Write a protein that binds this DNA or RNA. Structure first.
Lengths: 177, 165
DNA sequence: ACTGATTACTCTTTAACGTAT
DNA sequence: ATACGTTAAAGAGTAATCAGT
């Protein structure tokens, strides 16, 4: 039971988790709202996940990350709690990945740029052209998350598939009209 | 409405011979003018929400049968509006464009009105709305869910005051 | 009165799907 | 494969209510 014991929280690292939340609760909530959002953009974490896990309101949340819409300390604490825990989950997600022993896919900005330029060359890409974009996009989402491309399976639902690539061109071609 | 019982068939029959995007911009203009929510459409007609919005706003095509259900509702709808304004679905209020520039203009003059300013602004907004729908401002009870009230003016100025954040 | 916090509702956007070649 | 025609899901904007100042 080695890996699951890493997974368990050492009492000291638990006090660190709680300490970080208290620190942010004394910082500018607008300042911490930026980084929560930017992190949610770095890993393309739907707010619905936060709304589901936290118990907050999508609008109050959306308002609080898009604008400096204030929110009471108790509710912000839940967001801050979820934040520090998710950091560990995504860390393991990638770490415990690449080896063998209900979120929706969302196109990341880096991949989007890759795809747009490719659409200019050939709007209806060959299957091999499509696959070569998958890895190139996967790598870009990997380096955007600061992880090695090897741990691409950690992207989870945000893992680019050849089917998803073709769809992008398909919908974007469908948007020609 | 037997006098026009088949006129409406002629309307929808015309409309479906008509260009799809043209009739789509038309109903949206109609909905925007009377501030009718797309919900009520989706509720009565039964077409998919996303499809309707993607069609009324961008030109996404749909089958004539589904298109006919919209046209049938559009023709129908005209009757209730005119009949109800003449008479003089818990839909939610929505501010109409002419009413906003009125309220916005009043904003710079006074961020925090008092009661008498709010209620005078009411009628002014109810005017423009009745005018925007080509009906005498006397028939404002027909605006119904879109009838401006004082509490709404306070809420408007309130919410617009929270803009600072 | 009013700020303040909070929310149900409405709708545009998005990725995905099936059908009929 | 491709085009369509169609849509569940995600999020931001809108109007609103309750309560502590």
């Amino acid at each position: 039971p080695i890996l699951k014991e890493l997974e368990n929280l050492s009492p000291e690292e638990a006090a660190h988790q709680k300490a970080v939340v208290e620190t942010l609760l004394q910082e500018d909530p607008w300042r911490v709202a930026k980084m929560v959002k930017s992190y949610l953009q770095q890993h393309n974490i739907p707010q619905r996940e936060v709304v589901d896990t936290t118990g907050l309101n999508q609008s109050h949340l959306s308002q609080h990350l898009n604008k400096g819409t204030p929110m009471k300390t108790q509710k912000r604490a839940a967001l801050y709690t979820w934040y520090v825990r998710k950091q560990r989950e995504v860390a393991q997600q990638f770490t415990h990945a690449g080896q063998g022993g209900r979120n929706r896919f969302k196109w990341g900005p880096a991949s989007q740029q890759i795809l747009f330029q490719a659409y200019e060359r050939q709007k209806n890409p060959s299957k091999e052209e499509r696959e070569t974009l998958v890895e190139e996009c996967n790598r870009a989402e990997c380096i955007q998350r600061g992880v090695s491309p090897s741990q691409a399976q950690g992207l989870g639902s945000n893992l680019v598939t050849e089917v998803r690539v073709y769809n992008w061109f398909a919908n974007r071609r469908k948007e020609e009209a």
